[PDB]
Design a protein around this ligand. Sequence first.
Ligand SMILES: [Ca+2]
Ligand SMILES: [Ca+2]
Ligand SMILES: [Ca+2]
Lengths: 604, 143
Amino acid sequence: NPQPVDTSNITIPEKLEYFINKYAEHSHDKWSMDKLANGWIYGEIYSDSSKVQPLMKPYKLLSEKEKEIYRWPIKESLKTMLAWGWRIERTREGDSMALYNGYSPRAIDMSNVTLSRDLHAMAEMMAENYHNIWAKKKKMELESKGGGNHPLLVPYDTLTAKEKAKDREKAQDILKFLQINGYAVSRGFKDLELDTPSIEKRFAYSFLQQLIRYVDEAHQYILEFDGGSRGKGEHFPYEQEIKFFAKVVLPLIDQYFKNHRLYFLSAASRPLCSGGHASNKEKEMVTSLFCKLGVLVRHRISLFGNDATSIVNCLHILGQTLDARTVMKTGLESVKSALRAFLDNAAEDLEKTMENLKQGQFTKGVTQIINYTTVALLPMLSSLFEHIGQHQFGEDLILEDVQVSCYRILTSLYALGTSKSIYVERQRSALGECLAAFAGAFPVAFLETHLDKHNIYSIYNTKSSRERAALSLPTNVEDVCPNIPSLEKLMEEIVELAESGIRYTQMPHVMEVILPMLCSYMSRWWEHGPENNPERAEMCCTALNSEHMNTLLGNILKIIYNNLGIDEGAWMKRLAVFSQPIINKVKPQLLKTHFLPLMEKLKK
Amino acid sequence: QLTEEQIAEFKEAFSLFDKDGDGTITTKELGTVMRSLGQNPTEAELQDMINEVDADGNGTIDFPEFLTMMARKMKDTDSEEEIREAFRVFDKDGNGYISAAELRHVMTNLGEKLTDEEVDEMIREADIDGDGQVNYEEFVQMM
Ligand SMILES: [Ca+2]
Ligand SMILES: [Ca+2]
Ligand SMILES: [Ca+2]
């Protein structure tokens, strides 16, 4: 269906008439040359039957109508170019040929000089329009005949090069004669303003508003499913919407956040100095989306049809893609409340887990919360601490009130680890990596309170004696989290652990919580002690010495040596994931002749 | 009578042989698979053996016919038995947990060249249990 271009509203101007007459003369010249080469020469009378042609006469002597069939295509092409919004500006040659003012003509060839690329696209498009006008007239001709579809009715782009040849050649030669005259025509519009600082134009920003209000719609859908959960029939018209959510949005979030993790993590910080700057508001709303997704997945696992693992992976990758320092330096109250209520939700969740795993041994909500605790929660908290400690943004993320929230969560988690059962044996592995991440996350040395006072960046000292009482602070940094030992205490624990040589089946919780704990603990206080921060003397978070380092290495290696005699198991293969930071930690000087015995034993 | 996930596993098994995606296994399409397994068939042998399974007689067995031949045999426990059969033979270590080191070593048999380190990135995805060394339970998670 060809759509017309309207040319009635526009009309031809009069200063253009000079070039119009000039190009009419040029067309007469080319046509005269064509007929001379064809053999048509001047005739006494205009007779078609006598097979002669008088019209080699000059354009001064050509009649008015013959000028009209030159002016007609010319002025319609001009009307379809001015109707496009292509302005025409002032040039020099009008004034130049103003101060000018058996014959063989000669026509300038359009072939030599070449057009620019922008006006080449312009010419190709306007030749597309001229082909469309040809399609118009050919189409009315085809309803007139009634049949015989012309194969050229296909669109301009569908046409081949030979089919495009005539219309294109018209484009080049007319605009080329315009430029040889000198008249320069261009786009009529220059852009008025660019809203580049607006984050709204960012595709990620738009996709994210989309994601949050679909997440809110899904939350309302879950509220509907909850209001129908008191009834017996949960089959609702919202089944299609919830399965669309589950099999589209969550996979789409998953793929998007794995493909653009480098964008999300760093606002062009380490990579890609040119671009990839994730907006601060974008990071804010990404954290909001993560928080509301965590709220949605909570207490509602049983409704999901085994895609809860996919949701867990989505929440996991969102955790690796979270940012915290940007939120703290510039954060919106909704995100602040979401994070505070998420820590609180973890609080009562852990509390009710200790309550139910003990009380309700013998007796659905209880089953879904138990499954959540066993699988869908501990890797979640581990990944949270993992990105916190990886990016060190936790320094200001968990600065106020979240030190005490995280350290009481540490008390609950440590009590859960010290408690043992079959489900706890099944999850011995998770506590190791989780507490590793939390120890690499916590900014102050939550083990040793001794030098945390000397560290300025601490909950109690930074918030001082009045916000001390305002927050959930009992005025004692170490006592607010009682069960957790100190560095000193864990040191004697390790030394008599080495001197004892306990079996895994006896104290599984010890090596499956504390060893990765310290293995990822140690990294931050490298840079926060005289360890890798020789400067900032006596102001460091903690102070450690190479002698103590070598002693603890000797204890761990000797328990591993005793532990080679029980196959050494894949459970230290589990601990090996966070021992990889330890084997990057270890200096190459040790990698010369201090540890070669143990990797030789591994080669055994 | 056929259990719902079995047909779903029969879905994918049907597509494992239906490369073209139309749901029809032509003799040539089936034939290329049997050369890939080493056996060298005659065209008559393939077209003879394809007739017995074809109840319709169209010359190409569709999935409803494919189910009938699948129902002909006792795959009562052969599915997970083969899964364990592979886990036993892929367990070159014999520790009960299959290391990632020989994961590259058996996938090379088909001709793949994926890097040594990246697979243990993928085995870590398989090791949601975090074992660092894949067992049958991880294989069950895989399949
Ligand atoms: Ca058939
Ligand atoms: Ca193995
Ligand atoms: Ca494993």
